[PDB]
Every structure is written in structure tokens, then in C-alpha cells.
Design a protein around this ligand. Sequence first.
Ligand SMILES: Nc1nc(O[C@H](c2ccc(Cl)cc2-c2ccccc2)C(F)(F)F)cc(N2CCC3(CC2)CN[C@H](C(=O)O)C3)n1
Ligand SMILES: [Fe+3]
Length: 283
Amino acid sequence: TVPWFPKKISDLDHCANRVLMYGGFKDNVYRKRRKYFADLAMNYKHGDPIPKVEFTEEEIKTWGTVFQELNKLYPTHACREYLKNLPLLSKYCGYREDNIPQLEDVSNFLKERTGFSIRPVAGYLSPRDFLSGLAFRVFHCTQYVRHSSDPFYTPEPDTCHELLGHVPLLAEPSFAQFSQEIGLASLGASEEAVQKLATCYFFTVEFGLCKQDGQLRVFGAGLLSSISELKHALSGHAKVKPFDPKITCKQECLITTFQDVYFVSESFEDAKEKMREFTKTIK
Ligand SMILES: Nc1nc(O[C@H](c2ccc(Cl)cc2-c2ccccc2)C(F)(F)F)cc(N2CCC3(CC2)CN[C@H](C(=O)O)C3)n1
Ligand SMILES: [Fe+3]
């Protein structure tokens, strides 16, 4: 027997609500605001335009802080693919210090560039359900903004993380392929296989480094959206190892701290080839 998995993009309607939600913990205004976003995600069905949100002034200020500081780091810290796509997003999707891009606009942009699209999501999906989205080039994205007290690092994914961390690499064909292949490999796989695939995803897509012209750069979205961890990953204080799926899949994923190790890939093409070799051995 194989567990249920989606067979078409609309089938994601059936898992995308199977979510662990928030529950700032004591802030009534923050909570109400978080409920508003969760409900927009819960009521979403494939085919809908993604609701456009009027962000508050404080939400926009938190975005601006994050945007401003990160943009000072990307030239020296981000991989070339990231920096190639970031200007196109400014131009077409309204990435500016004073404006939070809408998921709808970014979804349309990605659909033209790599066939990627966005679905809003209320909170954390299982690794299984999250990965299954990537199989159809669907990236589940949070829509709320991180609490204003922690602009530099948050343990929870927010819309800043999705927009600044993930989107610019989803716009890159080799990366989109890489991601989709993790998804495809996950469909109907065993729990053990999903866990391995999810860890490899975590140490590439979320926290990966790559070597470009001899220097370390970042492609991990969890690094690209955290001012403090981005600095930390290239500071010389972090432990780094070669990306190697059979090893990297055993690494524990840390949740409320900086990671204890970053994996370095040679290129998106090479990481993809490495995952292809690996997936054979767990099917
Ligand atoms: N994928 C991912 N995963 C997280 O959690 C894991 C996970 C948890 C729960 C569930 Cl239900 C699933 C996963 C799970 C789901 C997809 C695949 C594999 C693992 C795990 F705990 F395993 F590590 C946290 C996270 N974040 C946290 C928030 C930041 C991005 C990374 C870190 N700092 C950034 C910033 O400051 O901008 C934002 N990303
Ligand atoms: Fe992420």
C-alpha cells in the first residue's frame, strides 16, 4: 500500500488545510491579525486568485527593516542566480522598502518564468504535504509578517522569508527543477524516505551554501531572509561540509537557533545529480 498522495495540482486542496497553527503570544491585536491571515489561507482553493492584503503600517515597517538590511548583504553574500533574479522582482512585483509584494503578483511572475506557483498556507504542513506541493511546482507560502520585535531572525516562516528567501530562486530554471525533483521523489514514499528527502531539502533549499568562482555564497532561503543568520553563515565561525545526501539526510534540523552546520553544494546542477543518485537508493 501507498499512502494518499496528490495526482494533480488541485488535489493540494485536500492537504493544504492539515496545518499546525500559531497558538505576540499574548498580544490580542497580533493574534486577531494572525487569525485573519490563517482564514484567508484556509478558504483558498486552487484556481482562486490569491487574496491581496492591505498590510498595516507596522507590517510594512518591519518589511522595510528586513529589506533594507538584507539588500546591503546580498551583493557579497548571495549566489549569482539570486542576484540575477532579484531586479526582475523589483521591477515586476513591487519589491521596495515601502511596499510588501502580494503573493498573487509573485505567483504570476513565477508561473511565466519556471511554471512555479504559490498557494497561501495557514501554518506548518507536514514534510510530506509540503514536499508534495513541490511535485507540481507549487510552493506553499505564509502571508503574515514576522512580529516587529524580531526583525533579524525568526524561528517561524513568514511572508518576508517566502518573498526574499525563496521566490528569487524559484524564478531560476535549474533551481526549480531541483526543487520539483525533491517533490516528485517524495510522492507516495515511505515515512523514512520522506524524512530523508525533507532533511536534504532543509539543508539545501532552506540552509544551503554553494561555492561559486571559489568563494562561498548562500542559496538557502532561511539564510537569505535572516539578517543575523546570513552574516553568521559566511562569517568564518560556522562549520561547513560538502553536500552529500547519504550524510546530510542524517543531520538534525534545528528549529529555534542558528544551524550547527551548513552544507556546501557545487552547483544546482550537481546537487540535483546527487539527489538523483540518492533517491534510487531509497526507492
Ligand atoms: N522548512 C522549514 N522547516 C522548519 O521547521 C522544520 C519543520 C517543522 C515542522 C514541520 Cl510540521 C515541518 C518541518 C519541515 C517542513 C518542510 C521540510 C522539512 C521540514 C523542522 F523543525 F524540522 F526543522 C522551519 C523553517 N524555517 C524557520 C523560519 C526561518 C526559515 C526556516 C528561519 N529564520 C528565517 C528568518 O529569520 O527569515 C525564517 N523552514
Ligand atoms: Fe522556507
